Amino acid sequence: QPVVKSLLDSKGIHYNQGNPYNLLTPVIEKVKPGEQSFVGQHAATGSVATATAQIMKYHNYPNKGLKDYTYTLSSNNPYFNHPKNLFAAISTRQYNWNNILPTYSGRESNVQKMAISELMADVGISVDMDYGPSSGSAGSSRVQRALKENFGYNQSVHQINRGDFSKQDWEAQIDKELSQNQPVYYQGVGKVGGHAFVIDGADGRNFYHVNWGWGGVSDGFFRLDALNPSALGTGGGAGGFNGYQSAVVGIKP
């Protein structure tokens, strides 16, 4: 296995889901029974969204959105009535990759914050992101689909299922992407949805550079036997976080 440095790091790409990244997510209007009130709360972008958007930042491909998108909020979302239609004017987006900073500290101006915030909203949207205080999306099917549909990434964008591949041929799909310094959108699905993160490097030992969807927890190498989030406690489907493990590889124009 060849060694690969962190592509996201080589681009000072450090994203989040609540910081100025969720400054454009849809606002919550209802409360979940068995939880606190989240109305008026800026929903999150979603790991899946942030995993893709980071790779979207790594390539800053569409300077303008490629195609308008549209999805109806999930009937499981306890944050809005339900027949809620979300719409991203992506086809009419202005992706200023110079304002969509690769790393936000939450103290930058609003202009650059508006940049990444819309990307996450466009991405989280393009991936039917569930928008609540926590944002759960589907993952690859959404990313690999939105990646080429709304952002038009090279057709090389596709989805693979770790559950259906052999660890060896599975890491091959990743390193191959890393061989060309091309990060991978990865995600281990379970009950809450597909938890995603970005692979942007390798250490020569079946280990890749991963950008979990959290702040600074297990950020560093990827996992081969435990593809779960170190900081559990997301939605209400905790427990067993490997129902559908898959990866989106080949994210580039």
Side-chain angles (χ1 to χ4, degrees):
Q1 179 154 355
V3 160
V4 186
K5 308 289 164 142
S6 159
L7 310 176
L8 298 198
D9 289 17
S10 82
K11 302 213 72 41
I13 291 179
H14 290 84
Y15 273 6
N16 244 142
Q17 318 151 288
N19 216 169
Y21 309 94
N22 73 355
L23 267 170
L24 278 184
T25 50
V27 205
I28 281 157
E29 292 159 16
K30 269 177 72 159
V31 176
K32 173 193 228 112
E35 212 103 298
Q36 268 76 30
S37 156
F38 299 105
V39 184
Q41 294 217 14
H42 258 298
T45 69
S47 39
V48 166
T50 332
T52 303
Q54 290 174 125
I55 301 155
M56 280 202 61
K57 171 73 187 147
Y58 186 94
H59 293 308
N60 16 80
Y61 164 38
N63 242 277
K64 221 177 218 263
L66 210 208
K67 173 194 154 187
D68 296 321
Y69 116 101
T70 184
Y71 86 85
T72 298
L73 208 66
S74 143
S75 103
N76 238 81
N77 195 313
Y79 301 102
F80 311 62
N81 297 263
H82 258 327
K84 148 71 146 215
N85 330 146
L86 274 92
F87 159 73
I90 308 188
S91 99
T92 95
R93 270 284 183 280
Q94 232 301 274
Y95 275 141
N96 201 56
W97 294 117
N98 180 1
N99 265 349
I100 308 180
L101 316 193
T103 171
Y104 285 93
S105 68
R107 320 180 42 95
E108 270 88 341
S109 104
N110 325 337
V111 168
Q112 302 116 278
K113 279 186 174 172
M114 196 174 272
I116 176 46
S117 47
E118 190 149 64
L119 165 86
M120 306 312 226
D122 312 327
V123 168
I125 275 192
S126 92
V127 296
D128 302 66
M129 172 63 57
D130 299 359
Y131 282 113
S134 341
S135 295
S137 140
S140 316
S141 54
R142 298 304 195 274
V143 175
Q144 72 96 349
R145 175 129 276 134
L147 277 179
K148 293 181 298 187
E149 264 176 354
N150 228 284
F151 312 105
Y153 271 68
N154 187 9
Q155 279 301 109
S156 78
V157 162
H158 49 303
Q159 167 189 173
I160 50 164
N161 275 261
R162 162 64 187 284
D164 304 73
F165 280 78
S166 87
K167 196 166 113 230
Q168 278 73 79
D169 283 301
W170 178 253
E171 290 196 331
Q173 280 287 133
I174 290 150
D175 237 314
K176 188 239 183 166
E177 285 315 308
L178 292 190
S179 71
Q180 321 161 49
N181 292 334
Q182 302 183 196
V184 165
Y185 155 100
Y186 205 102
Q187 76 148 16
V189 189
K191 315 228 274 140
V192 316
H195 202 244
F197 51 93
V198 175
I199 277 160
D200 53 63
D203 215 347
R205 289 180 118 158
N206 296 354
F207 265 130
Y208 298 112
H209 192 270
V210 161
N211 176 323
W212 293 119
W214 285 107
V217 44
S218 285
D219 226 290
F221 49 90
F222 107 125
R223 241 65 96 86
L224 32 159
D225 228 292
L227 219 312
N228 328 326
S230 233
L232 277 146
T234 32
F241 212 146
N242 174 200
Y244 224 60
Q245 200 150 312
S246 32
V248 176
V249 300
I251 308 170
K252 61 142 228 155

Coordinates of all heavy atoms in Angstrom, one line a residue, residues 55-142:
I55 N -15.1 17.5 0.3 CA -14.5 17.1 -1.0 C -15.0 18.0 -2.1 O -14.3 18.2 -3.1 CB -15.0 15.6 -1.2 CG1 -14.6 14.7 -0.1 CG2 -14.4 15.1 -2.6 CD1 -15.5 13.5 0.0
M56 N -16.1 18.7 -1.9 CA -16.6 19.6 -2.9 C -15.6 20.8 -2.8 O -15.3 21.5 -3.8 CB -18.0 20.1 -2.6 CG -19.0 19.0 -3.1 SD -20.6 19.8 -3.3 CE -20.1 20.9 -4.6
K57 N -15.2 21.1 -1.6 CA -14.2 22.3 -1.4 C -12.9 21.8 -1.9 O -12.2 22.6 -2.6 CB -14.1 22.6 0.1 CG -13.0 23.6 0.4 CD -13.4 25.0 -0.1 CE -12.2 25.9 0.0 NZ -12.3 26.9 -1.1
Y58 N -12.5 20.6 -1.6 CA -11.2 20.1 -2.1 C -11.1 20.3 -3.6 O -10.0 20.5 -4.2 CB -11.0 18.6 -1.8 CG -9.6 18.2 -2.2 CD1 -8.6 18.2 -1.2 CD2 -9.3 17.8 -3.5 CE1 -7.3 17.8 -1.6 CE2 -8.0 17.5 -3.9 CZ -7.0 17.5 -2.9 OH -5.8 17.1 -3.2
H59 N -12.2 20.2 -4.3 CA -12.1 20.4 -5.8 C -12.7 21.7 -6.2 O -12.5 22.2 -7.3 CB -12.9 19.3 -6.5 CG -12.2 18.0 -6.2 ND1 -10.9 17.8 -6.5 CD2 -12.7 16.8 -5.7 CE1 -10.6 16.5 -6.2 NE2 -11.6 15.9 -5.7
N60 N -13.6 22.3 -5.4 CA -14.2 23.6 -5.7 C -14.6 23.5 -7.2 O -14.2 24.3 -8.0 CB -13.2 24.8 -5.5 CG -11.8 24.2 -5.4 OD1 -11.2 23.9 -6.4 ND2 -11.3 24.1 -4.2
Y61 N -15.3 22.5 -7.6 CA -15.6 22.2 -9.0 C -16.6 23.2 -9.6 O -16.2 24.1 -10.4 CB -16.1 20.8 -9.2 CG -16.8 20.7 -10.5 CD1 -16.3 21.4 -11.6 CD2 -17.9 19.8 -10.7 CE1 -16.9 21.3 -12.9 CE2 -18.5 19.7 -11.9 CZ -18.1 20.4 -13.0 OH -18.7 20.3 -14.2
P62 N -17.9 23.1 -9.2 CA -18.9 24.0 -9.8 C -18.7 25.5 -9.3 O -19.1 25.8 -8.2 CB -20.2 23.4 -9.4 CG -19.9 22.6 -8.1 CD -18.5 22.1 -8.3
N63 N -18.3 26.3 -10.1 CA -18.2 27.8 -9.7 C -19.6 28.2 -9.6 O -20.0 29.2 -8.9 CB -17.4 28.6 -10.7 CG -16.2 29.2 -10.1 OD1 -16.2 30.2 -9.4 ND2 -15.0 28.5 -10.2
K64 N -20.5 27.6 -10.3 CA -22.0 27.9 -10.3 C -22.7 26.5 -10.2 O -22.2 25.5 -10.6 CB -22.3 28.5 -11.7 CG -23.3 29.7 -11.4 CD -23.6 30.4 -12.7 CE -23.7 31.9 -12.5 NZ -25.2 32.3 -12.3
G65 N -23.8 26.5 -9.6 CA -24.5 25.2 -9.4 C -24.8 24.6 -10.8 O -25.1 25.3 -11.7
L66 N -24.8 23.3 -10.8 CA -25.0 22.6 -12.1 C -26.5 22.3 -12.4 O -27.0 22.4 -13.5 CB -24.3 21.2 -12.1 CG -23.9 20.8 -13.6 CD1 -23.8 19.3 -13.7 CD2 -24.9 21.4 -14.6
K67 N -27.3 22.0 -11.3 CA -28.7 21.7 -11.6 C -29.6 22.0 -10.4 O -29.2 21.7 -9.3 CB -28.9 20.2 -12.0 CG -30.3 19.9 -12.1 CD -30.5 18.4 -12.1 CE -31.9 18.0 -11.5 NZ -32.0 16.5 -11.4
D68 N -30.7 22.6 -10.6 CA -31.6 22.9 -9.4 C -31.9 21.5 -8.8 O -31.9 20.5 -9.5 CB -32.8 23.6 -9.9 CG -32.5 25.0 -10.4 OD1 -31.6 25.6 -9.9 OD2 -33.1 25.3 -11.4
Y69 N -32.2 21.5 -7.5 CA -32.5 20.2 -6.9 C -33.9 20.3 -6.2 O -34.3 21.4 -5.9 CB -31.4 19.8 -5.8 CG -32.2 19.8 -4.5 CD1 -32.6 18.6 -3.9 CD2 -32.6 21.0 -4.1 CE1 -33.4 18.7 -2.8 CE2 -33.4 21.1 -3.0 CZ -33.8 19.9 -2.3 OH -34.7 19.9 -1.3
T70 N -34.4 19.2 -5.7 CA -35.7 19.4 -4.8 C -36.0 18.0 -4.1 O -35.9 17.0 -4.7 CB -36.9 19.8 -5.7 OG1 -38.0 20.0 -4.8 CG2 -37.2 18.7 -6.7
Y71 N -36.3 18.1 -2.8 CA -36.6 16.9 -2.0 C -37.6 17.2 -0.9 O -37.6 18.3 -0.4 CB -35.4 16.2 -1.4 CG -35.1 16.8 0.0 CD1 -35.7 16.4 1.1 CD2 -34.1 17.9 0.1 CE1 -35.4 16.9 2.4 CE2 -33.9 18.4 1.4 CZ -34.5 18.0 2.5 OH -34.2 18.5 3.7
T72 N -38.5 16.3 -0.6 CA -39.5 16.6 0.4 C -39.0 16.1 1.8 O -38.4 15.0 1.8 CB -40.9 15.9 0.1 OG1 -41.4 16.4 -1.1 CG2 -41.9 16.2 1.3
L73 N -39.1 16.8 2.8 CA -38.6 16.4 4.1 C -39.1 15.0 4.5 O -40.2 14.6 4.2 CB -38.9 17.4 5.2 CG -37.9 17.4 6.3 CD1 -36.5 17.9 5.7 CD2 -38.3 18.3 7.4
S74 N -38.2 14.2 5.1 CA -38.6 12.9 5.6 C -39.8 12.9 6.5 O -39.9 13.8 7.4 CB -37.4 12.2 6.2 OG -37.9 11.4 7.3
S75 N -40.7 11.9 6.5 CA -41.9 11.9 7.4 C -41.4 11.6 8.8 O -42.2 11.5 9.7 CB -42.9 10.9 6.9 OG -42.8 9.7 7.7
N76 N -40.1 11.3 9.0 CA -39.6 11.0 10.3 C -39.0 12.2 11.0 O -38.7 12.2 12.2 CB -38.5 9.9 10.2 CG -38.8 8.7 11.0 OD1 -39.6 7.8 10.5 ND2 -38.3 8.5 12.2
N77 N -38.9 13.3 10.3 CA -38.4 14.6 10.8 C -39.4 15.2 11.8 O -40.5 15.6 11.4 CB -38.2 15.5 9.6 CG -37.4 16.7 10.1 OD1 -37.6 17.3 11.1 ND2 -36.4 17.1 9.3
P78 N -39.1 15.2 13.0 CA -39.9 15.7 14.1 C -39.6 17.2 14.3 O -39.9 17.8 15.3 CB -39.5 15.0 15.3 CG -38.0 14.5 15.1 CD -37.8 14.7 13.5
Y79 N -39.0 17.8 13.3 CA -38.6 19.3 13.4 C -39.5 20.1 12.5 O -39.6 21.3 12.7 CB -37.2 19.4 13.0 CG -36.3 18.6 14.0 CD1 -35.8 17.3 13.5 CD2 -36.1 19.0 15.3 CE1 -35.1 16.6 14.4 CE2 -35.3 18.2 16.1 CZ -34.8 17.0 15.7 OH -34.1 16.2 16.6
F80 N -40.2 19.6 11.6 CA -41.1 20.4 10.7 C -42.5 19.7 10.6 O -42.5 18.5 10.9 CB -40.5 20.6 9.3 CG -39.1 21.0 9.4 CD1 -38.1 20.2 10.0 CD2 -38.7 22.2 8.8 CE1 -36.8 20.5 10.0 CE2 -37.3 22.6 8.8 CZ -36.4 21.8 9.4
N81 N -43.5 20.3 10.1 CA -44.8 19.6 9.9 C -44.4 18.2 9.2 O -44.2 17.2 9.9 CB -45.7 20.4 9.1 CG -46.0 21.7 9.8 OD1 -47.1 21.8 10.5 ND2 -45.2 22.7 9.7
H82 N -44.3 18.3 7.9 CA -43.9 17.0 7.2 C -43.9 17.2 5.7 O -42.9 16.9 5.1 CB -44.6 15.8 7.7 CG -43.7 15.1 8.6 ND1 -42.3 15.1 8.4 CD2 -43.9 14.4 9.8 CE1 -41.7 14.5 9.5 NE2 -42.6 14.0 10.3
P83 N -45.0 17.7 5.2 CA -45.0 18.0 3.8 C -44.2 19.3 3.5 O -44.7 20.3 3.1 CB -46.5 18.2 3.5 CG -47.1 18.6 4.8 CD -46.2 18.1 5.9
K84 N -43.0 19.2 3.8 CA -42.1 20.3 3.7 C -41.2 20.1 2.5 O -40.5 19.1 2.4 CB -41.2 20.4 5.0 CG -39.8 20.9 4.7 CD -39.9 22.4 4.3 CE -38.6 23.1 4.8 NZ -39.0 24.5 5.3
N85 N -41.2 21.0 1.5 CA -40.4 20.8 0.3 C -39.2 21.7 0.4 O -39.3 22.9 0.5 CB -41.2 21.2 -0.9 CG -42.7 20.9 -0.7 OD1 -43.6 21.6 -1.2 ND2 -43.1 19.9 0.1
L86 N -38.0 21.1 0.4 CA -36.8 21.9 0.4 C -36.3 22.2 -1.0 O -36.4 21.3 -1.9 CB -35.7 21.2 1.3 CG -35.9 21.5 2.8 CD1 -36.8 20.5 3.4 CD2 -34.6 21.6 3.5
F87 N -35.8 23.3 -1.3 CA -35.3 23.6 -2.7 C -34.0 24.4 -2.7 O -33.8 25.4 -2.0 CB -36.4 24.5 -3.4 CG -35.8 25.2 -4.6 CD1 -35.5 24.5 -5.7 CD2 -35.6 26.6 -4.5 CE1 -35.0 25.2 -6.8 CE2 -35.1 27.3 -5.6 CZ -34.8 26.6 -6.8
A88 N -33.1 23.9 -3.5 CA -31.7 24.6 -3.6 C -31.6 25.2 -4.9 O -31.7 24.5 -5.9 CB -30.6 23.6 -3.4
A89 N -31.5 26.5 -5.0 CA -31.4 27.1 -6.4 C -29.9 26.9 -6.9 O -29.3 27.8 -7.4 CB -31.6 28.6 -6.3
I90 N -29.5 25.7 -6.7 CA -28.1 25.4 -7.2 C -27.9 25.8 -8.6 O -27.0 26.6 -8.9 CB -27.9 23.9 -7.0 CG1 -28.2 23.5 -5.6 CG2 -26.4 23.5 -7.2 CD1 -27.8 22.0 -5.3
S91 N -28.7 25.3 -9.5 CA -28.5 25.8 -10.9 C -28.2 27.3 -11.0 O -27.6 27.8 -11.9 CB -29.7 25.4 -11.8 OG -30.5 26.6 -11.9
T92 N -28.7 28.0 -10.0 CA -28.5 29.5 -10.0 C -27.6 29.8 -8.8 O -27.8 30.8 -8.1 CB -29.9 30.2 -9.8 OG1 -30.1 30.4 -8.4 CG2 -31.0 29.3 -10.3
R93 N -26.7 29.0 -8.5 CA -25.8 29.2 -7.3 C -24.5 29.9 -7.8 O -24.1 29.8 -8.9 CB -25.3 27.9 -6.7 CG -26.3 27.5 -5.6 CD -26.1 28.4 -4.3 NE -27.0 27.9 -3.3 CZ -28.3 28.4 -3.3 NH1 -28.7 29.0 -4.3 NH2 -29.0 28.1 -2.2
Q94 N -23.9 30.6 -6.9 CA -22.6 31.3 -7.2 C -21.6 30.7 -6.3 O -21.3 31.2 -5.2 CB -22.8 32.8 -6.9 CG -22.3 33.6 -8.2 CD -20.9 33.3 -8.5 OE1 -19.9 33.9 -8.0 NE2 -20.6 32.3 -9.4
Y95 N -20.9 29.7 -6.7 CA -19.9 29.0 -5.9 C -18.6 29.8 -5.9 O -17.7 29.4 -6.7 CB -19.7 27.6 -6.3 CG -20.7 26.7 -5.7 CD1 -21.3 25.6 -6.5 CD2 -21.1 26.8 -4.4 CE1 -22.2 24.8 -5.9 CE2 -22.1 26.0 -3.8 CZ -22.6 24.9 -4.6 OH -23.6 24.1 -4.0
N96 N -18.4 30.8 -5.1 CA -17.2 31.5 -5.1 C -16.2 30.7 -4.3 O -16.1 30.8 -3.1 CB -17.3 32.9 -4.4 CG -16.2 33.8 -4.9 OD1 -16.0 34.0 -6.0 ND2 -15.5 34.4 -4.0
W97 N -15.5 29.8 -4.9 CA -14.5 28.9 -4.2 C -13.4 29.8 -3.5 O -12.7 29.2 -2.7 CB -13.8 28.0 -5.2 CG -14.9 27.0 -5.7 CD1 -15.2 27.0 -7.0 CD2 -15.7 26.0 -5.0 NE1 -16.2 26.0 -7.2 CE2 -16.5 25.4 -6.0 CE3 -15.8 25.6 -3.7 CZ2 -17.4 24.4 -5.6 CZ3 -16.7 24.6 -3.3 CH2 -17.5 24.0 -4.3
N98 N -13.4 31.0 -3.7 CA -12.4 31.9 -3.0 C -13.1 32.4 -1.7 O -12.4 32.7 -0.7 CB -12.1 33.1 -3.8 CG -11.1 34.0 -3.1 OD1 -10.6 33.7 -2.0 ND2 -10.7 35.1 -3.7
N99 N -14.4 32.3 -1.6 CA -15.1 32.7 -0.3 C -15.4 31.4 0.5 O -15.5 31.4 1.7 CB -16.3 33.4 -0.7 CG -16.1 35.0 -0.6 OD1 -15.0 35.4 -0.2 ND2 -17.0 35.8 -1.1
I100 N -15.6 30.3 -0.2 CA -15.9 29.0 0.5 C -14.6 28.5 1.1 O -14.1 27.5 0.7 CB -16.4 28.0 -0.5 CG1 -17.6 28.6 -1.3 CG2 -16.9 26.8 0.2 CD1 -18.1 27.6 -2.3
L101 N -14.1 29.2 2.1 CA -12.8 28.8 2.7 C -12.9 27.3 3.1 O -13.9 26.8 3.3 CB -12.7 29.6 4.0 CG -13.0 31.1 3.7 CD1 -12.6 32.0 4.9 CD2 -12.3 31.6 2.5
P102 N -11.7 26.7 3.0 CA -11.6 25.3 3.3 C -11.6 25.1 4.9 O -11.8 24.0 5.3 CB -10.2 25.0 2.7 CG -9.4 26.3 2.6 CD -10.4 27.4 2.7
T103 N -11.4 26.1 5.6 CA -11.4 25.9 7.1 C -12.0 27.1 7.7 O -11.5 28.2 7.6 CB -10.0 25.7 7.6 OG1 -10.0 25.7 9.1 CG2 -9.1 26.8 7.1
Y104 N -13.1 27.0 8.5 CA -13.7 28.2 9.1 C -13.5 28.1 10.6 O -13.6 27.1 11.3 CB -15.2 28.1 8.8 CG -15.5 28.6 7.4 CD1 -15.6 27.6 6.4 CD2 -15.6 29.9 7.1 CE1 -15.8 28.0 5.1 CE2 -15.9 30.3 5.8 CZ -16.0 29.3 4.8 OH -16.2 29.7 3.5
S105 N -13.2 29.3 11.2 CA -13.0 29.3 12.7 C -14.2 29.9 13.4 O -14.3 29.9 14.6 CB -11.8 30.2 13.0 OG -12.1 31.6 12.7
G106 N -15.2 30.2 12.6 CA -16.5 30.8 13.2 C -16.3 32.3 13.4 O -17.2 32.9 13.9
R107 N -15.2 32.8 13.1 CA -14.9 34.3 13.4 C -14.7 35.0 12.1 O -14.6 36.2 12.0 CB -13.7 34.5 14.2 CG -13.6 33.4 15.3 CD -12.4 33.6 16.2 NE -12.2 35.0 16.5 CZ -12.6 35.5 17.6 NH1 -12.1 35.2 18.7 NH2 -13.7 36.4 17.5
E108 N -14.8 34.3 11.0 CA -14.6 34.9 9.6 C -15.8 35.9 9.3 O -16.8 35.9 10.0 CB -14.5 33.9 8.6 CG -13.0 33.5 8.4 CD -12.7 32.4 9.3 OE1 -13.4 32.2 10.3 OE2 -11.7 31.7 9.1
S109 N -15.7 36.7 8.3 CA -16.8 37.6 8.0 C -18.0 36.7 7.5 O -18.0 35.5 7.4 CB -16.4 38.5 6.8 OG -17.0 38.0 5.6
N110 N -19.1 37.4 7.3 CA -20.4 36.6 6.9 C -20.3 36.2 5.4 O -20.7 35.2 5.0 CB -21.6 37.5 7.1 CG -21.4 38.4 8.4 OD1 -20.6 38.1 9.2 ND2 -22.1 39.5 8.5
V111 N -19.7 37.1 4.6 CA -19.6 36.8 3.2 C -19.0 35.4 3.0 O -19.6 34.5 2.4 CB -18.7 37.8 2.5 CG1 -18.3 37.3 1.1 CG2 -19.4 39.1 2.4
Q112 N -17.8 35.2 3.5 CA -17.1 33.8 3.4 C -18.0 32.8 4.1 O -18.1 31.6 3.7 CB -15.7 33.8 4.0 CG -14.9 34.9 3.2 CD -14.5 36.0 4.2 OE1 -15.3 36.9 4.5 NE2 -13.3 36.0 4.8
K113 N -18.6 33.2 5.2 CA -19.5 32.2 5.9 C -20.7 31.9 5.1 O -21.1 30.7 4.9 CB -19.9 32.8 7.2 CG -18.8 32.7 8.3 CD -19.4 33.2 9.6 CE -18.3 33.0 10.7 NZ -18.8 33.6 12.0
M114 N -21.2 32.8 4.4 CA -22.4 32.6 3.5 C -22.0 31.6 2.4 O -22.7 30.8 2.0 CB -22.9 33.9 2.9 CG -24.3 33.7 2.3 SD -24.9 35.3 1.7 CE -25.6 35.8 3.3
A115 N -20.7 31.7 2.0 CA -20.2 30.8 0.9 C -20.3 29.4 1.3 O -21.1 28.6 0.8 CB -18.8 31.2 0.6
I116 N -19.6 29.0 2.3 CA -19.6 27.5 2.7 C -21.0 27.2 3.2 O -21.5 26.1 2.9 CB -18.6 27.3 3.9 CG1 -18.7 25.8 4.4 CG2 -18.8 28.2 5.0 CD1 -18.8 24.8 3.2
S117 N -21.7 28.0 4.0 CA -23.0 27.7 4.5 C -24.0 27.3 3.4 O -24.7 26.4 3.5 CB -23.6 28.9 5.2 OG -23.4 30.1 4.4
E118 N -23.9 28.0 2.3 CA -24.8 27.7 1.1 C -24.3 26.4 0.5 O -25.1 25.5 0.2 CB -24.7 28.8 0.1 CG -25.8 28.6 -1.0 CD -26.3 29.9 -1.6 OE1 -25.5 30.6 -2.2 OE2 -27.4 30.2 -1.3
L119 N -23.0 26.2 0.4 CA -22.5 24.9 -0.2 C -23.1 23.8 0.7 O -23.7 22.8 0.1 CB -21.0 24.9 -0.1 CG -20.5 23.4 -0.3 CD1 -20.3 23.1 -1.8 CD2 -19.1 23.3 0.4
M120 N -22.9 23.8 1.9 CA -23.5 22.8 2.8 C -25.0 22.7 2.6 O -25.6 21.6 2.5 CB -23.2 23.1 4.3 CG -21.7 23.4 4.5 SD -20.7 22.1 3.7 CE -19.6 21.8 5.0
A121 N -25.7 23.8 2.5 CA -27.1 23.7 2.3 C -27.4 23.2 0.9 O -28.3 22.4 0.8 CB -27.7 25.2 2.4
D122 N -26.6 23.5 0.0 CA -26.8 23.0 -1.4 C -26.4 21.5 -1.3 O -27.2 20.6 -1.8 CB -25.9 23.7 -2.4 CG -26.0 25.2 -2.2 OD1 -27.1 25.6 -1.9 OD2 -25.0 25.9 -2.4
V123 N -25.3 21.2 -0.7 CA -24.9 19.7 -0.6 C -25.9 19.0 0.3 O -26.6 18.1 -0.2 CB -23.5 19.6 0.0 CG1 -23.3 18.2 0.4 CG2 -22.5 20.1 -1.0
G124 N -26.0 19.4 1.5 CA -27.0 18.7 2.4 C -28.3 18.6 1.7 O -29.0 17.6 1.8
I125 N -28.7 19.6 1.0 CA -30.0 19.5 0.2 C -29.8 18.5 -0.9 O -30.5 17.5 -1.0 CB -30.3 20.9 -0.4 CG1 -31.0 21.7 0.6 CG2 -31.2 20.6 -1.6 CD1 -31.6 22.9 0.0
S126 N -28.9 18.7 -1.7 CA -28.7 17.8 -2.9 C -28.7 16.4 -2.4 O -29.0 15.4 -3.1 CB -27.3 18.1 -3.6 OG -26.3 17.3 -3.0
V127 N -28.3 16.1 -1.1 CA -28.3 14.7 -0.6 C -29.5 14.5 0.3 O -29.4 13.8 1.2 CB -27.0 14.5 0.2 CG1 -25.8 14.6 -0.8 CG2 -26.8 15.5 1.3
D128 N -30.6 15.1 0.0 CA -31.8 14.9 0.8 C -31.4 14.9 2.3 O -31.9 14.1 3.1 CB -32.5 13.6 0.5 CG -32.8 13.6 -1.0 OD1 -31.9 13.6 -1.8 OD2 -34.0 13.5 -1.3
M129 N -30.5 15.8 2.7 CA -30.1 15.8 4.1 C -31.3 16.0 5.1 O -32.1 16.9 4.9 CB -29.2 17.0 4.3 CG -28.9 17.2 5.8 SD -28.0 15.7 6.4 CE -26.6 15.8 5.2
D130 N -31.3 15.3 6.1 CA -32.4 15.5 7.1 C -32.0 16.7 8.0 O -30.9 16.7 8.5 CB -32.6 14.2 8.0 CG -32.9 13.0 7.2 OD1 -33.1 13.2 6.0 OD2 -33.0 11.9 7.7
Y131 N -32.8 17.7 8.0 CA -32.4 18.9 8.7 C -33.0 19.1 10.1 O -34.1 19.5 10.2 CB -32.7 20.1 7.9 CG -31.7 20.3 6.8 CD1 -32.2 20.1 5.4 CD2 -30.4 20.6 7.1 CE1 -31.2 20.2 4.4 CE2 -29.5 20.7 6.0 CZ -29.9 20.5 4.7 OH -29.0 20.7 3.7
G132 N -32.3 18.9 11.1 CA -32.7 19.1 12.5 C -31.5 19.7 13.2 O -30.6 20.1 12.6
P133 N -31.5 19.7 14.5 CA -30.3 20.2 15.2 C -29.2 19.3 14.8 O -28.0 19.6 14.7 CB -30.7 20.2 16.7 CG -32.0 19.2 16.8 CD -32.6 19.2 15.4
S134 N -29.5 18.0 14.6 CA -28.6 17.0 14.1 C -29.0 16.8 12.6 O -30.2 16.7 12.3 CB -28.7 15.7 14.9 OG -29.3 16.0 16.1
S135 N -28.1 16.7 11.7 CA -28.6 16.5 10.3 C -28.2 15.1 9.8 O -27.0 14.8 9.6 CB -28.0 17.5 9.4 OG -28.5 18.8 9.8
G136 N -29.1 14.2 9.5 CA -28.8 12.9 9.0 C -29.2 12.7 7.6 O -30.3 13.1 7.2
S137 N -28.4 12.3 6.7 CA -28.7 12.1 5.3 C -28.7 10.6 4.9 O -28.6 9.8 5.8 CB -27.7 12.9 4.4 OG -27.4 12.1 3.3
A138 N -28.7 10.3 3.7 CA -28.7 8.9 3.3 C -27.2 8.6 3.1 O -26.7 7.6 3.7 CB -29.4 8.7 2.0
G139 N -26.5 9.4 2.3 CA -25.1 9.2 2.1 C -24.7 9.0 0.7 O -25.0 9.8 -0.2
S140 N -24.0 8.0 0.4 CA -23.5 7.7 -1.0 C -24.6 7.9 -2.1 O -24.5 8.7 -3.0 CB -22.9 6.3 -1.1 OG -22.1 6.1 0.0
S141 N -25.6 7.1 -2.0 CA -26.7 7.2 -3.0 C -27.1 8.7 -3.2 O -27.4 9.1 -4.2 CB -28.0 6.5 -2.5 OG -28.3 6.9 -1.2
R142 N -27.0 9.4 -2.1 CA -27.3 10.9 -2.2 C -26.1 11.6 -2.7 O -26.1 12.4 -3.6 CB -27.6 11.4 -0.8 CG -28.8 10.7 -0.2 CD -30.0 10.9 -1.2 NE -31.3 10.6 -0.5 CZ -31.7 9.3 -0.5 NH1 -31.8 8.6 -1.6 NH2 -31.9 8.7 0.7

